[PDB]
Every structure is written in C-alpha cells, then in structure tokens.
Amino acid sequence: GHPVLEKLKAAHSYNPKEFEWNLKSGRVFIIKSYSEDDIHRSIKYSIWCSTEHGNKRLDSAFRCMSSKGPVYLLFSVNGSGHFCGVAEMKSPVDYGTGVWSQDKWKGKFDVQWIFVKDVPNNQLRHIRLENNDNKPVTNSRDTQEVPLEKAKQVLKIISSYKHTTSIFDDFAHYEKRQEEEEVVRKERQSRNK
Amino acid sequence: HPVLEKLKAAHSYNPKEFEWNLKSGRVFIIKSYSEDDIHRSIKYSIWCSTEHGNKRLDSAFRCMSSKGPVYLLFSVNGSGHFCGVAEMKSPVDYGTSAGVWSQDKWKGKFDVQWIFVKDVPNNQLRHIRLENNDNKPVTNSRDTQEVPLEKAKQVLKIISSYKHTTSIFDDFAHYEKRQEEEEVVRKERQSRNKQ
C-alpha cells in the first residue's frame, strides 16, 4: 500500500476479527456521504461532518448517550451501491473555525474508524427499518437512525463480510485528487484578489 | 478543452445585454457543496438541491407558471465568491432516468440554463441585505433562500456588470479530468466487487 496508508493501518486496528455486534445499548445511524473524497478525508483525519441538520441530530444523540453506550455510524457513498465502513462517534460537534480553498468542512466531530471495507447493498437490502416505512436499510437517507435489533444484523454482516475491495485500494488516487483540487482553488483565489 | 467548445457552440455565456430590472420573477440563492457539482451543472444543464430544497424550488417554478423567470444565484460553500447565474427551466424530475444525469449522486434533477459563469467576490455584494433573512447580507444566505425582487435586481446588476478575472471555465480541463478519472475508479470498484 501507499506509505501514508501503511502508517494509518499501523496506528489503527481496522477490520478487527473480533467485534461485538450484539450490542446491549447504543444508537446507530446511517451516514450517506456525498463523495468518496469525504470518506478518504474522514479516515485520514478521524473526523466527520454532516449537514447542519444532520450535525444537530448526531450531536444530540451523542450527548444523550453520554457514558451510556456507543454511537455507531454506517457509511455509504451516494450512488455507490455499497456500504464502505463503520465508525464510532467519539466527540460532540465542534462548529468552530480556509474551508473552501482546502476543501474542508464547516464543523467536525471525532470518529474512530472501525471497518473499512466495501459491502454490496444486495448483501444488506433484506434488512428493513420499521421506523422508515419498512424500506430496506440500503434506501436510508443521511443520519437515519437504525433500530438496535436491525443495527445488530447489519453490523454482523459488515463485520463478517469477506470483502474484495475497499476505499483503500484508491488511496493514492484520492491523495492526488485532494492535492490537485487544493492547488486549483488556491490559484483561483489568487487571481480573484 | 473540446467539451468547453461544444458548450460554447450551443450556448452564449455572459451576454453583454441582460435585463437585471426584473418586471416579475422569483430569485433564489443556490449553495453548492462543491466545484464538481458546478461543473456537472454547466455541462449537462441540470441541478439538484436537497430534498427540502427541491420542494421549495419546484413549488416556486410551478407557481411562476410562465408569469416570469426563476433565477438561481450560485455560490460554492465557503468560496467567498458567487460563480454564476442560471435560469430554472423545468420542474424537478425524480424519475428512474433522473439518476443517470449524475451517475446516481443526485436523487433527481431539474433543467437549468446557465447565463453568467463568472467569479464575483462577496465584497462586491455584502452590502445588499435581505429583509426576509433578518437583514443578513445576501452573501450569508443558505441554500434556496429567496431574494426579494428589488434586492435581486441589485445583485443581478452587479454580477452582469462585474469585470471578473476568472471563472470555473478556467479550470474546465481540471474538472473534466476529475470526472473521467473518478468514473474509471467507480467502474473498477464495481467490477472487482462482483466476485
């Protein structure tokens, strides 16, 4: 793998062989990401940012779960056909202060990435959310909460899946994307000044 | 870039004459999540807002049933500039065919006609304030905030008449490469995930 990727894997325990999916407590939410660049940035820097309204929903869930159970986030990129990983929410939302020229977010919270692996939606499409009109979990919108029993089923399948690919297969590609976009925006800013 | 040429063959951008003194119409701020969205919008003459944002624009367009135009003032989140103006040209389509226009990144689409493609810094506009957004500057608006018609005329006049030094057109090959390289990655991921 890419050498930065080598050290990221070294510092974290991605895709653990033993993960407790039969949660006694917790809250679980779907994250519908706009792009794989967000996911790549999220894994590299251990942070997430939803919309303004999604941030408020997740922040409130985290604060009502204080020292009482995990908040897990199940990640899927819009249009990708796959779930791409799982992280735990680890801080409240900090709405604090170049968001555009460096393509960062207008706020952030800490996440601990746990699973980084592509799971086809057809592997999960059979699980239905009674609190979303019994639609399949794979048709959820961003920050949809998953009832705990259904979340347990989804987490067992993602943890046990023997994936053939993950966003890590394109690590250098997403590094180059981010770098080139940052130069482009900096230049565009410069000329406008 | 050639695609930029096929576009200029079909449309004329930044007209030297544009009526900014609107007799009628409704005008909305559009806040884009990225430059990639802006590039895709200019290329395929489409847009898609949030679910809530689509309902607001759809209702507005259907209510303006030829009585007047619906203009969209575009700004990428965090950018410090506005980057163009388009006219909304259709209602929202949520159909099955809608997704192919965005490779399923968007839940749907509606047609737009881009008119101005030019970077206009917020400091040319921050003095225009919105009595329907608590008198905040028009440049601190959120996605699909409606602009009162008189204030919209002021904004449209400054955008039309501003001597811009750059536009997203100047990065067009960049965003073309971004779209193809990404699409290659997407196909390869899907292939490798079929066994």
Short mmCIF file of C-alpha atoms in Angstrom, two decimals:
data_model
loop_
_atom_site.label_atom_id
_atom_site.label_comp_id
_atom_site.label_asym_id
_atom_site.label_seq_id
_atom_site.Cartn_x
_atom_site.Cartn_y
_atom_site.Cartn_z
CA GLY A 1 0.00 0.00 0.00
CA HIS A 2 0.81 3.71 -0.12
CA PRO A 3 3.30 4.57 2.68
CA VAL A 4 0.93 7.01 4.40
CA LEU A 5 -1.66 4.23 4.24
CA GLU A 6 0.92 1.84 5.72
CA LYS A 7 1.22 4.05 8.81
CA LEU A 8 -2.53 4.69 9.11
CA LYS A 9 -3.12 0.94 9.25
CA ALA A 10 -0.24 0.74 11.74
CA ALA A 11 -1.81 3.26 14.12
CA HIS A 12 -5.35 1.84 13.92
CA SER A 13 -6.96 -1.57 14.18
CA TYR A 14 -9.05 -1.61 11.00
CA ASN A 15 -11.39 -4.51 10.28
CA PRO A 16 -10.97 -6.32 13.62
CA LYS A 17 -11.58 -10.08 13.61
CA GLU A 18 -13.40 -9.86 16.97
CA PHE A 19 -16.06 -7.14 17.11
CA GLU A 20 -19.07 -7.17 19.46
CA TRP A 21 -22.09 -6.75 17.15
CA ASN A 22 -24.72 -7.91 19.69
CA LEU A 23 -24.89 -4.51 21.37
CA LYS A 24 -26.56 -4.20 24.74
CA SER A 25 -27.05 -0.47 24.21
CA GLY A 26 -26.17 2.31 21.79
CA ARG A 27 -27.58 4.26 18.89
CA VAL A 28 -26.80 3.58 15.25
CA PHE A 29 -27.18 5.88 12.27
CA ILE A 30 -26.70 5.67 8.53
CA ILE A 31 -24.26 8.17 7.04
CA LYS A 32 -24.92 8.98 3.38
CA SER A 33 -21.75 10.66 2.13
CA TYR A 34 -21.70 12.96 -0.90
CA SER A 35 -18.37 11.60 -2.15
CA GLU A 36 -15.53 9.19 -1.54
CA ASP A 37 -13.25 12.19 -1.02
CA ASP A 38 -15.15 12.85 2.22
CA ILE A 39 -14.68 9.25 3.33
CA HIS A 40 -10.97 9.34 2.48
CA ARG A 41 -10.54 12.60 4.40
CA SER A 42 -12.58 11.13 7.26
CA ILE A 43 -10.35 8.08 7.67
CA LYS A 44 -7.15 10.08 7.34
CA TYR A 45 -8.08 12.66 9.97
CA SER A 46 -10.57 10.76 12.20
CA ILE A 47 -13.38 13.33 11.77
CA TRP A 48 -16.83 13.59 10.18
CA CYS A 49 -19.21 16.45 9.36
CA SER A 50 -22.85 16.05 8.35
CA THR A 51 -25.19 18.76 7.13
CA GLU A 52 -26.21 21.44 9.59
CA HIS A 53 -29.36 19.49 10.42
CA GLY A 54 -27.59 16.12 10.43
CA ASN A 55 -24.91 17.53 12.75
CA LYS A 56 -27.63 18.67 15.17
CA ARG A 57 -29.29 15.23 15.06
CA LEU A 58 -25.98 13.39 15.66
CA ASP A 59 -24.78 15.86 18.30
CA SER A 60 -28.00 15.43 20.26
CA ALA A 61 -27.80 11.63 20.02
CA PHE A 62 -24.20 11.68 21.24
CA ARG A 63 -25.00 13.96 24.18
CA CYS A 64 -27.99 11.83 25.24
CA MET A 65 -25.78 8.72 25.07
CA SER A 66 -23.13 10.11 27.45
CA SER A 67 -21.21 7.29 29.17
CA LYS A 68 -24.12 5.02 28.30
CA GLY A 69 -23.36 3.21 25.04
CA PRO A 70 -21.71 3.63 21.66
CA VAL A 71 -22.83 5.78 18.77
CA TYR A 72 -22.00 3.92 15.54
CA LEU A 73 -22.12 5.36 12.01
CA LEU A 74 -22.69 3.08 8.98
CA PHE A 75 -21.18 4.75 5.92
CA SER A 76 -22.39 4.61 2.31
CA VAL A 77 -21.47 6.95 -0.57
CA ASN A 78 -24.50 8.17 -2.57
CA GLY A 79 -24.87 6.16 -5.77
CA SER A 80 -22.04 3.75 -4.93
CA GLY A 81 -24.19 0.64 -4.44
CA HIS A 82 -22.16 -0.24 -1.34
CA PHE A 83 -21.60 0.42 2.32
CA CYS A 84 -17.96 1.32 2.80
CA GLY A 85 -17.24 1.10 6.51
CA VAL A 86 -18.25 1.73 10.10
CA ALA A 87 -17.00 4.27 12.66
CA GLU A 88 -17.84 5.19 16.24
CA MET A 89 -18.80 8.78 17.09
CA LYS A 90 -16.30 9.97 19.73
CA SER A 91 -16.92 13.71 20.35
CA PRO A 92 -19.76 16.24 20.17
CA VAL A 93 -19.88 18.54 17.17
CA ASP A 94 -17.44 21.45 17.23
CA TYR A 95 -18.80 24.20 14.95
CA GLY A 96 -15.51 26.15 15.25
CA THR A 97 -13.45 27.96 12.56
CA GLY A 98 -9.94 28.06 4.54
CA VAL A 99 -12.95 25.73 4.38
CA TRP A 100 -13.18 26.25 0.60
CA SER A 101 -9.61 26.63 -0.66
CA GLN A 102 -8.58 23.50 1.28
CA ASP A 103 -11.97 21.76 0.72
CA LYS A 104 -12.52 21.04 4.43
CA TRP A 105 -15.85 21.16 6.33
CA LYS A 106 -17.78 23.84 8.24
CA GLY A 107 -17.63 21.91 11.52
CA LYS A 108 -16.44 18.49 12.63
CA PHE A 109 -16.65 15.75 15.23
CA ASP A 110 -14.21 12.97 16.09
CA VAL A 111 -14.78 9.48 14.77
CA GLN A 112 -12.92 6.21 15.32
CA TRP A 113 -12.98 4.23 12.08
CA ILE A 114 -13.51 0.54 12.77
CA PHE A 115 -14.40 -1.17 9.48
CA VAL A 116 -13.03 -0.06 6.12
CA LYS A 117 -14.41 -2.46 3.50
CA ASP A 118 -16.92 -2.44 0.66
CA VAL A 119 -20.09 -4.46 1.28
CA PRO A 120 -22.56 -4.62 -1.66
CA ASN A 121 -26.03 -3.31 -0.86
CA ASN A 122 -27.51 -6.60 -2.09
CA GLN A 123 -25.90 -8.17 1.00
CA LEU A 124 -27.96 -5.90 3.30
CA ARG A 125 -31.03 -4.87 1.22
CA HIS A 126 -33.10 -7.54 3.01
CA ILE A 127 -32.99 -5.71 6.36
CA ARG A 128 -35.94 -3.31 6.69
CA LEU A 129 -36.39 -0.31 9.00
CA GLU A 130 -39.77 -0.23 10.71
CA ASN A 131 -39.08 3.45 11.54
CA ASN A 132 -38.57 4.21 7.83
CA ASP A 133 -41.75 2.73 6.33
CA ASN A 134 -40.18 -0.74 6.21
CA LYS A 135 -37.85 0.35 3.44
CA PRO A 136 -34.55 -1.53 3.15
CA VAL A 137 -31.72 -0.14 5.27
CA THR A 138 -29.93 0.43 1.93
CA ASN A 139 -32.51 3.10 0.95
CA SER A 140 -31.94 5.20 4.07
CA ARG A 141 -31.22 8.93 3.96
CA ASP A 142 -28.40 10.67 5.83
CA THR A 143 -28.47 10.29 9.65
CA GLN A 144 -31.40 7.85 9.50
CA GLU A 145 -31.44 6.11 12.87
CA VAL A 146 -31.40 2.29 12.77
CA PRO A 147 -33.39 0.40 15.46
CA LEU A 148 -30.91 -1.51 17.57
CA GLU A 149 -32.00 -5.05 16.59
CA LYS A 150 -31.77 -4.17 12.88
CA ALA A 151 -28.41 -2.48 13.55
CA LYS A 152 -27.09 -5.69 15.14
CA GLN A 153 -27.99 -7.62 11.97
CA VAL A 154 -26.29 -5.03 9.75
CA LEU A 155 -23.15 -4.94 11.93
CA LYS A 156 -22.81 -8.75 11.93
CA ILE A 157 -22.96 -8.84 8.12
CA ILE A 158 -20.50 -5.97 7.65
CA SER A 159 -18.03 -7.34 10.19
CA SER A 160 -18.19 -10.92 8.85
CA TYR A 161 -18.18 -9.97 5.14
CA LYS A 162 -15.08 -11.11 3.24
CA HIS A 163 -14.66 -8.02 1.10
CA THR A 164 -12.77 -7.94 -2.17
CA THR A 165 -12.17 -4.19 -2.17
CA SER A 166 -12.21 -1.02 -0.06
CA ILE A 167 -11.65 2.70 -0.49
CA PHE A 168 -8.02 1.97 0.48
CA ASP A 169 -7.45 0.45 -2.98
CA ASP A 170 -7.62 4.02 -4.36
CA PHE A 171 -5.62 5.74 -1.61
CA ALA A 172 -3.05 7.40 -3.88
CA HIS A 173 -5.83 8.41 -6.27
CA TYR A 174 -7.72 10.27 -3.52
CA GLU A 175 -4.47 11.85 -2.26
CA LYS A 176 -3.77 13.22 -5.72
CA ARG A 177 -7.37 14.41 -6.12
CA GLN A 178 -7.25 16.37 -2.87
CA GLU A 179 -3.83 17.88 -3.63
CA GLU A 180 -4.70 19.00 -7.16
CA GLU A 181 -8.05 20.45 -6.10
CA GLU A 182 -6.31 22.43 -3.36
CA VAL A 183 -3.81 23.92 -5.82
CA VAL A 184 -6.60 24.76 -8.29
CA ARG A 185 -8.69 26.58 -5.68
CA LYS A 186 -5.65 28.45 -4.31
CA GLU A 187 -4.80 29.66 -7.82
CA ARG A 188 -8.42 30.64 -8.49
CA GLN A 189 -8.49 32.58 -5.22
CA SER A 190 -5.19 34.29 -6.11
CA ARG A 191 -6.38 35.63 -9.48
CA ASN A 192 -9.59 36.93 -7.92
CA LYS A 193 -7.58 39.04 -5.45
CA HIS B 1 -10.88 21.92 -23.76
CA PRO B 2 -13.12 20.49 -26.52
CA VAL B 3 -16.18 19.89 -24.32
CA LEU B 4 -15.99 23.56 -23.39
CA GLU B 5 -16.13 24.24 -27.14
CA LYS B 6 -19.17 22.01 -27.73
CA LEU B 7 -20.88 24.01 -24.96
CA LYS B 8 -20.00 27.39 -26.42
CA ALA B 9 -21.37 26.12 -29.74
CA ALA B 10 -24.79 25.58 -28.14
CA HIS B 11 -24.99 28.47 -25.61
CA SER B 12 -23.73 32.03 -25.23
CA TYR B 13 -22.41 32.79 -21.77
CA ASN B 14 -22.11 36.16 -20.04
CA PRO B 15 -24.23 38.18 -22.51
CA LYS B 16 -23.30 41.82 -22.91
CA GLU B 17 -27.01 42.70 -22.59
CA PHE B 18 -29.17 41.25 -19.80
CA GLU B 19 -32.31 42.74 -18.22
CA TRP B 20 -31.50 42.95 -14.48
CA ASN B 21 -34.51 45.21 -13.75
CA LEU B 22 -36.92 42.31 -13.39
CA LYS B 23 -40.55 43.14 -14.04
CA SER B 24 -41.51 39.86 -12.34
CA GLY B 25 -39.93 36.60 -11.20
CA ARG B 26 -38.52 34.82 -8.18
CA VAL B 27 -34.81 34.64 -7.35
CA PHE B 28 -33.05 32.09 -5.11
CA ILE B 29 -29.57 31.62 -3.70
CA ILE B 30 -28.04 28.22 -4.55
CA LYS B 31 -25.26 26.99 -2.21
CA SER B 32 -23.28 24.21 -3.92
CA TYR B 33 -21.38 21.58 -1.92
CA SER B 34 -18.52 21.57 -4.42
CA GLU B 35 -16.99 22.83 -7.65
CA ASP B 36 -17.55 19.33 -9.09
CA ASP B 37 -21.31 19.96 -8.80
CA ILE B 38 -20.98 23.33 -10.56
CA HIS B 39 -19.03 21.78 -13.40
CA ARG B 40 -21.59 18.99 -13.82
CA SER B 41 -24.38 21.61 -13.78
CA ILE B 42 -22.88 23.75 -16.55
CA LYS B 43 -22.02 20.66 -18.61
CA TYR B 44 -25.39 18.90 -18.59
CA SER B 45 -27.58 21.98 -17.87
CA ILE B 46 -29.04 20.45 -14.69
CA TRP B 47 -29.22 20.97 -10.95
CA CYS B 48 -30.39 19.07 -7.89
CA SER B 49 -30.82 20.59 -4.43
CA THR B 50 -31.56 18.77 -1.16
CA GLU B 51 -34.93 17.07 -0.74
CA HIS B 52 -36.23 20.14 1.10
CA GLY B 53 -34.51 22.44 -1.39
CA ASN B 54 -36.07 20.75 -4.41
CA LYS B 55 -39.56 21.11 -2.95
CA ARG B 56 -39.02 24.85 -2.43
CA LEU B 57 -37.72 25.40 -5.99
CA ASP B 58 -40.28 23.05 -7.57
CA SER B 59 -43.21 24.79 -5.90
CA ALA B 60 -41.73 28.17 -6.86
CA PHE B 61 -41.29 27.22 -10.53
CA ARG B 62 -44.74 25.63 -10.86
CA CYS B 63 -46.28 28.74 -9.23
CA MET B 64 -44.40 31.06 -11.64
CA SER B 65 -46.21 29.23 -14.50
CA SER B 66 -44.77 31.41 -17.31
CA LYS B 67 -45.71 34.57 -15.38
CA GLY B 68 -41.94 35.14 -15.08
CA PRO B 69 -38.45 33.70 -14.68
CA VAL B 70 -36.84 31.83 -11.80
CA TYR B 71 -33.18 32.80 -11.45
CA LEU B 72 -30.60 30.88 -9.40
CA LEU B 73 -27.58 32.75 -7.94
CA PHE B 74 -24.83 30.16 -7.45
CA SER B 75 -22.10 30.10 -4.76
CA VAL B 76 -19.88 27.17 -3.66
CA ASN B 77 -19.91 26.73 0.14
CA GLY B 78 -17.05 28.65 1.72
CA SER B 79 -15.79 30.14 -1.55
CA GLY B 80 -16.08 33.87 -0.82
CA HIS B 81 -17.45 34.45 -4.34
CA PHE B 82 -20.54 33.83 -6.41
CA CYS B 83 -19.77 31.85 -9.54
CA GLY B 84 -22.70 32.42 -11.88
CA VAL B 85 -26.41 32.72 -12.55
CA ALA B 86 -28.75 30.25 -14.20
CA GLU B 87 -32.45 30.14 -15.02
CA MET B 88 -34.56 27.24 -13.78
CA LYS B 89 -36.14 25.67 -16.85
CA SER B 90 -38.12 22.61 -15.69
CA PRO B 91 -39.79 21.16 -12.61
CA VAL B 92 -37.97 18.53 -10.56
CA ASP B 93 -37.79 15.06 -12.12
CA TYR B 94 -37.46 12.24 -9.57
CA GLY B 95 -37.92 9.51 -12.18
CA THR B 96 -35.79 6.44 -12.83
CA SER B 97 -33.92 8.14 -15.69
CA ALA B 98 -33.13 11.10 -13.41
CA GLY B 99 -30.10 9.48 -11.79
CA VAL B 100 -28.10 8.79 -14.94
CA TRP B 101 -27.52 12.55 -15.41
CA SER B 102 -25.42 12.50 -12.20
CA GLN B 103 -24.24 8.85 -12.02
CA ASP B 104 -26.74 8.44 -9.13
CA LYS B 105 -25.01 11.05 -6.96
CA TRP B 106 -28.27 13.09 -7.13
CA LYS B 107 -31.73 11.86 -6.20
CA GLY B 108 -33.17 13.70 -9.19
CA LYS B 109 -32.74 16.69 -11.45
CA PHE B 110 -34.33 19.75 -12.98
CA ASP B 111 -33.16 21.63 -16.06
CA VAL B 112 -31.29 24.92 -15.85
CA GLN B 113 -29.95 27.37 -18.43
CA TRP B 114 -26.65 28.91 -17.35
CA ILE B 115 -26.44 32.61 -18.20
CA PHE B 116 -23.48 34.05 -16.28
CA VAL B 117 -20.38 31.99 -15.45
CA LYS B 118 -18.04 34.37 -13.63
CA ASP B 119 -16.48 34.78 -10.20
CA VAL B 120 -17.85 37.80 -8.32
CA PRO B 121 -16.33 38.34 -4.85
CA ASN B 122 -18.66 38.63 -1.90
CA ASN B 123 -17.23 42.03 -1.07
CA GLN B 124 -18.95 43.37 -4.20
CA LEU B 125 -22.29 42.19 -2.74
CA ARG B 126 -22.13 42.06 1.09
CA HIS B 127 -23.81 45.47 1.29
CA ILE B 128 -27.09 44.09 -0.14
CA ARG B 129 -29.07 42.80 2.84
CA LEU B 130 -32.15 40.59 2.97
CA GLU B 131 -35.13 41.97 4.89
CA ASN B 132 -36.53 38.39 4.80
CA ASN B 133 -33.34 36.95 6.30
CA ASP B 134 -33.18 39.25 9.34
CA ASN B 135 -31.24 41.82 7.29
CA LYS B 136 -28.26 39.48 6.96
CA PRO B 137 -26.02 40.15 3.93
CA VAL B 138 -27.19 38.38 0.78
CA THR B 139 -23.75 36.73 0.84
CA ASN B 140 -24.53 34.96 4.16
CA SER B 141 -27.61 33.19 2.77
CA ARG B 142 -28.31 29.45 2.96
CA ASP B 143 -29.30 27.17 0.06
CA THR B 144 -32.58 28.24 -1.68
CA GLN B 145 -33.04 31.42 0.35
CA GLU B 146 -35.39 33.62 -1.68
CA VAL B 147 -34.15 37.13 -2.56
CA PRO B 148 -36.74 39.96 -2.58
CA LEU B 149 -37.11 41.18 -6.13
CA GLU B 150 -35.62 44.66 -5.60
CA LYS B 151 -32.54 43.26 -3.84
CA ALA B 152 -32.25 40.57 -6.53
CA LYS B 153 -32.17 43.29 -9.18
CA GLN B 154 -29.24 44.97 -7.41
CA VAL B 155 -27.38 41.63 -7.22
CA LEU B 156 -28.09 40.77 -10.85
CA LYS B 157 -26.86 44.21 -11.95
CA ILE B 158 -23.54 43.84 -10.10
CA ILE B 159 -22.98 40.29 -11.39
CA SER B 160 -23.80 41.22 -15.01
CA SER B 161 -21.62 44.32 -14.92
CA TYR B 162 -18.66 42.99 -12.88
CA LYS B 163 -15.27 42.76 -14.60
CA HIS B 164 -14.35 39.26 -13.46
CA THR B 165 -10.78 37.99 -13.68
CA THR B 166 -11.66 34.29 -13.59
CA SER B 167 -14.45 31.71 -13.74
CA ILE B 168 -14.79 27.94 -13.29
CA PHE B 169 -14.30 27.80 -17.07
CA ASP B 170 -10.60 28.44 -16.40
CA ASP B 171 -10.40 25.09 -14.56
CA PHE B 172 -12.54 23.18 -17.04
CA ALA B 173 -9.94 20.62 -18.18
CA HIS B 174 -9.14 20.09 -14.48
CA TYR B 175 -12.76 19.21 -13.68
CA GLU B 176 -13.11 17.14 -16.87
CA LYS B 177 -10.13 15.02 -15.77
CA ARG B 178 -11.63 14.80 -12.26
CA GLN B 179 -14.90 13.41 -13.68
CA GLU B 180 -13.36 10.80 -16.00
CA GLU B 181 -10.67 9.57 -13.58
CA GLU B 182 -13.34 9.22 -10.90
CA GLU B 183 -15.69 7.32 -13.24
CA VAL B 184 -12.87 4.91 -14.10
CA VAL B 185 -12.32 4.25 -10.38
CA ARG B 186 -16.05 3.70 -9.98
CA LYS B 187 -16.30 1.08 -12.73
CA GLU B 188 -13.17 -0.73 -11.48
CA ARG B 189 -14.54 -0.84 -7.92
CA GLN B 190 -17.86 -2.23 -9.18
CA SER B 191 -16.13 -4.88 -11.32
CA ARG B 192 -13.84 -6.06 -8.51
CA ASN B 193 -16.92 -6.23 -6.26
CA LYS B 194 -18.78 -8.73 -8.47
CA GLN B 195 -16.75 -11.83 -7.48
#
